[PDB]
Amino acid sequence: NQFYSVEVGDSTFTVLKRYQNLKPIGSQGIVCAAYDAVLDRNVAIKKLSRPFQNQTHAKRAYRELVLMKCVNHKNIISLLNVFTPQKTLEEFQDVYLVMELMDANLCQVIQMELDHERMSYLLYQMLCGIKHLHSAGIIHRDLKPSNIVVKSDCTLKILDFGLASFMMTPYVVTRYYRAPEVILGMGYKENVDIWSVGCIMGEMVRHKILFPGRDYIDQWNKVIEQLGTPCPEFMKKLQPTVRNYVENRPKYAGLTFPKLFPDSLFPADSEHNKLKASQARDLLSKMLVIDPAKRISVDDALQHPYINVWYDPAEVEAPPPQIQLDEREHTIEEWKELIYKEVMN
Numbered sequence: 572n573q574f575y576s577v578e579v580g581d582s583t584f585t586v587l588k589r590y591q592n593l594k595p596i597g598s599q600g601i602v603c604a605a606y607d608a609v610l611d612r613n614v615a616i617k618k619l620s621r622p623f624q625n626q627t628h629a630k631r632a633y634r635e636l637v638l639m640k641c642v643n644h645k646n647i648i649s650l651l652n653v654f655t656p657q658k659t660l661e662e663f664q665d666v667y668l669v670m671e672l673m674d675a676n677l678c679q680v681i682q683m684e685l686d687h688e689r690m691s692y693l694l695y696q697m698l699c700g701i702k703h704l705h706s707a708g709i710i711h712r713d714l715k716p717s718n719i720v721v722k723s724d725c726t727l728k729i730l731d732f733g734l735a736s737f738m739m740t741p742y743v744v745t746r747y748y749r750a751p752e753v754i755l756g757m758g759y760k761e762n763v764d765i766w767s768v769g770c771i772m773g774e775m776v777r778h779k780i781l782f783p784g785r786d787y788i789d790q791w792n793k794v795i796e797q798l799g800t801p802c803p804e805f806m807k808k809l810q811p812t813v814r815n816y817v818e819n820r821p822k823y824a825g826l827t828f829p830k831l832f833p834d835s836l837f838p839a840d841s842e843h844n845k846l847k848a849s850q851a852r853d854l855l856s857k858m859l860v861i862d863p864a865k866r867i868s869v870d871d872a873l874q875h876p877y878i879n880v881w882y883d884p885a886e887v888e889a890p891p892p893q894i895q896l897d898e899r900e901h902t903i904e905e906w907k908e909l910i911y912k913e914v915m916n
């Protein structure tokens with residue numbers, strides 16, 4: 572038999588025999604690190620348990636399978652192998668995704684102070700991964716630090732492809748990085764992801780979540796509290812019922828960016844460091860913009876002085892993926908077969 576079974580906490584991992592010394596590194600679902608004896612390297616293994624059980628799990632799993640396959644960019648996680656231990660459609664239950672492995676979540680990097688070279692390089696790569704996605708027509712909308720992984724040598728990759736919806740999960744879905752246009756459901760374009768990058772970068776500097784809060788109500792309060800109530804221009808673009816709510820909230824003038832992000836948070840002992848600090852804060856002030864009509868584009872932000880030192884036309888303008896009916900609604904049974912079909916290939 573090609574498979575063996577091993578307990579990893581309260582989950583059984585049934586994986587191919589090439590994969591060994593599994594260690595839980597996540598529970599973005601159930602993930603193990605493993606040594607792959609065939610390729611002689613370490614891999615990440617994600618167990619998708621009954622991905623067809625509901626529409627939300629099934630859409631995400633199918634979208635994860637399809638896109639991780641036909642996307643080949645250094646700043647997006649690579650798929651190495653896909654398998655099920657079950658032998659037929661009737662028996663079918665679990666999918667295992669085999670991805671390349673890095674060293675840490677972006678959560679762990681946020682907890683440390685970084686020099687400007689590393690901070691700016693990470694930010695450059697996030698912008699690269701996102702841009703490649705946009706040119707395939709993939710707008711992410713859910714970039715968060717737990718979806719972003721890094722290696723010791725400062726290399727960065729994005730793990731997921733974002734938003735495609737009720738669920739009975741014990742866990743909560745994080746909202747802290749979602750854009751004003753998503754929170755208020757007002758439509759969006761490419762620069763919806765720039766907001767998310769601004770939240771991450773600001774968290775990298777402050778070492779705290781910029782806009783925490785239990786709900787979209789609490790979350791909006793936090794946004795306007797720090798950045799100020801947005802313009803009439805912005806207001807006039809809101810559905811009258813959303814617009815009623817936003818316009819009838821307590822008003823804040825908001826804080827200037829020097830106030831929101833003081834120099835004590837940036838390395839600024841030397842002159843090179845002092846200049847980078849002001850470049851980093853400028854770019855923050857252009858990403859953390861509520862009105863997406865005034866928020867910086869992905870291309871403008873790659874051309875920004877803080878970022879552009881890393882600019883590579885091969886990394887920034889890589890041939891867009893080819894890629895298909897991806898607003899799909901299906902039953903459990905239909906999803907089951909689409910996924911199996913894709914897994915079996």
Ligand SMILES: O=C1/C(=N/O)c2cc(F)ccc2N1Cc1cc(F)cc2c1OCOC2
Pocket residue numbers: 596597599602604615617648670671672673674675676720721730
């Ligand atoms: O690098 C990855 C990864 N690659 O697919 C990966 C994939 C995931 F689904 C989750 C995390 C991933 N991490 C972060 C990570 C790597 C480790 F070797 C060890 C740990 C890591 O983070 C948690 O703490 C332990």
